[PDB]
Each structure stands twice: as C-alpha cells, then as structure tokens.
Amino acid sequence: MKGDTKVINYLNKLLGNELVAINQYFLHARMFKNWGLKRLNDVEYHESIDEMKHADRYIERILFLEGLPNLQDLGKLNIGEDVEEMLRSDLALELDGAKNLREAIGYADSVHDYVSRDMMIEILRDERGHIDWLRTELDLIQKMGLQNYLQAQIREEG
Amino acid sequence: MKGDTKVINYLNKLLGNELVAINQYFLHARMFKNWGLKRLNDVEYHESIDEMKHADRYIERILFLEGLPNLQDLGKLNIGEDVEEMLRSDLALELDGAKNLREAIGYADSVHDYVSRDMMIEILRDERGHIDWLRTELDLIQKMGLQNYLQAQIREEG
Ligand code: HEM
Ligand SMILES: [Zn+2]
C-alpha cells in the first residue's frame, strides 16, 4: 500500500538530517577521542549510534510505504574547530531538525498516518534529550570558559 | 605526529569507498527485509555494520596522523532493483575497493607506515570474504534464475 506522498517526502527530508547528524557526531566523537576527551567521545559516539537507529527507523518506514529512501544526497556537515564550536554546531543541527520534525508530525497527524506520526514523536523525544544535554554543557562552557571546562573534563574523568 | 600526506590521501579515498558501502549495503539490507527475505537482510545488514567498523578504523588512523577525515563527500551509490542487480553492484564496489586497497598497502609499506599498511591488510582480508560470499550467491541465482531463486528463499523461510 503506497503511503501519503508528502509523508514519504517528510520522512526522506528527516532521514537527510539524520544522515548529516550521524557523520557530524561520529567525526566530532573521534576528534574528542583523539584529543583525549574520553567523556565527550563516549557521549558523542552514542549520540551518533542513536542517530543511526533513527535513520534505520526512517528507512524501514519509507520502504514500507513504498517510497525510495534517499541515502545519496548528504547535506552540509558543520564540523567545529574546537570543542565549543563542535557542540554549538550539534545544537544548531538538532534544533533545525526538531522544527522539521514537529512540522512533519503535524502533517502526518492531519492525514491520519498515526503510525508515522508516533514514530516521529518517539524520535523527537530522543532528540530533545540531546538538546537538553547540549544546553547544559554549553552553559558550563559559558560560565567556566572553554579552557577551564576542558581541564575539568580531563581532571574529572581521570 | 603528522603522517605521510599521500598515505593520508589514500586513507581518505579508501574511507570514501567505505562510506558508499555503508549506505549501499544498509539500504540493500532493508530492501531485502521489506521483501521478507530475512536471510539476505541478515547477511547484508552485518556487511553494512562491518563496513562501519572499517570506516571507524580509517577515521581514527587519519586523525592520529593529523589529517582531516572526509565524511562530507559521498560517492555514487549504485542501488539495484532486484536481488541479482543489488548483489552484483555490491561485488563491483568491493572489487574496485580491493584494487584501491592493494595500491595503498604497497604505498604505505614503501614509506614504512606499517601501522597503516597492516590495518589495510586486515580490512582487505575482510573485503575478500564478502567477495567470496557474493560470487557463490550470484552463481546460485544464475543457476536457478532469479524468479525461482526468490521462490526458494520464501519456501525455505517461515
Ligand atoms: C559515517 C558513517 C557511519 C559510521 C562510521 C557508522 C558506525 C557504526 C558503528 C561503529 C556501529 C557499532 C557497531 C558495533 O557495535 O561494533 C554502528 C552501528 C549501527 N549502525 Fe552505523 N555508522 C554509520 C552510518 C550508518 C547509517 C547511515 C545507518 C542507517 C542509515 C547506520 C545504521 C546502524 C545501525 C542500525 C547500527 C546498530 C545499532 C545498535 O543496535 O546497536 N549506520 N554504526
Ligand atoms: Zn535522530
């Protein structure tokens, strides 16, 4: 059974944001790791994996609705040059994606595709966990300054 | 500290091949899944994951060598429309990567970057296992014909 075409188009757009997030978070994670920031690697690596899981959900749903998942067109990665920039870029990506997601949810609701709607709602809740974490780290960077924040990362992980 | 420039360029090219393989194999896998081909999904899915592991190896090595991993440029996916096309496309990709690997291995060796050389040798051994499996499966589809091959798969499954 062919799904709603605009629903599939939304799912592909959202998948597109996840593909950027997977790569951006994975590269940021390994950058953190290479800098010896073990906590940040662990957090960022698991964020990347969670985005992979999201992408998989999108791919499965699109195929079920007889659409064609687009894994070809990779959007712009915004790789930061220091830890503050990297986290700010992650936050910007999450917020952009979240707005897209809320609009998509509304649309799926409007055409009674409740299964797609609810899948996207679960995903939204996940992204909001990451947004909450990011805002906390960034607040601490603001308060401490990046260099003291980084010293504390290393010292507190031990 | 900083690695050989050409080694890093090879590692980035090779990483590029892995990024295509990740997406191509993942989509192929979920296509198999959606078609109720559980065994084909399982093999293709784990191939995708192994290519992810390969990419991680490249990313970490590049960073250690103080290069910039390229996760932005994604090469051409060649997504098949039936099981035979899809598997043959996977083989083409692997064979192309395999030749790239062999060149890079010889080159890393020549500048005494044995860590990169041996990493690539291990990855190549993995790629060659996939090539082996692909040839045998393609042989079966040729022998049976794709219509009867697919009927066998579902007879045997569930
Ligand atoms: C730069 C690209 C990617 C990299 C480097 C990468 C890397 C990884 C790694 C390291 C793992 C963990 C494997 C292990 O446990 O040893 C993983 C798991 C996984 N990946 Fe990816 N991945 C990438 C892209 C993708 C994409 C695009 C998708 C889907 C569209 C995807 C789907 C998955 C899934 C479903 C898992 C298993 C999650 C779980 O159940 O634990 N990956 N990936
Ligand atoms: Zn997500």
Ligand SMILES: [Zn+2]
């Ligand atoms: Zn590989």
